[PDB]
Amino acid sequence: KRSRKESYSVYVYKVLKQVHPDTGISSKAMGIMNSFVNDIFERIAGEASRLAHYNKRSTITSREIQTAVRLLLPGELAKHAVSEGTKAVTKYTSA
């Protein structure tokens, strides 16, 4: 089949290898994680698009993403996720 099916297997495996060095993962578990990543991605993206439509904007920015993360995740998760996102962006722009 000519068509290719991009997935998140290799990135999830990199994350796993830095988190738990000597633990494998099954194929069914990898499919679970793939579905999880896609689900959370589309949740955040939909909320960002909504709250950009409300404010008569056209661009999806870091601010829209940060507000969507604050609206979707519970307390401690949202706090840590915001920390990670801002750290990444400030490291990026100063590169």
């Binding site: 709250l51 409300y54 404010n55 601010r63 507000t67 604050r70 609206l71």
Partner: protein
């Protein structure tokens, strides 16, 4: 400041809310429970309303912020704009 005010939801008001729900006899300890659950619901909604408001860089909480915070929890509300 603005402290206390949860006892401002008096016992007759809760009895009225129960009568509209069809309740015929009410216990003695349900007023505490109702105050607790009302406080929980209100915090959960007001957090999101304030989040929307401060993303828009405003200081006034609009009614649209409230209807959005409600819609995002499966509590759609008709008649206040939108």
């Amino acid at each position: 400041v603005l402290r206390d005010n949860i006892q401002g939801i008096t016992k007759p008001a809760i009895r009225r809310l129960a009568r509209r729900g069809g309740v015929k006899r009410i216990s003695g300890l349900i007023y505490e429970e109702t105050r607790g659950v009302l406080k929980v619901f209100l915090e959960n909604v007001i957090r999101d309303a304030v989040t929307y408001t401060e993303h828009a860089k405003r200081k006034t909480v609009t009614a649209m912020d409230v209807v959005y915070a409600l819609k995002r929890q499966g509590r759609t509300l008709y008649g206040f704009g939108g």
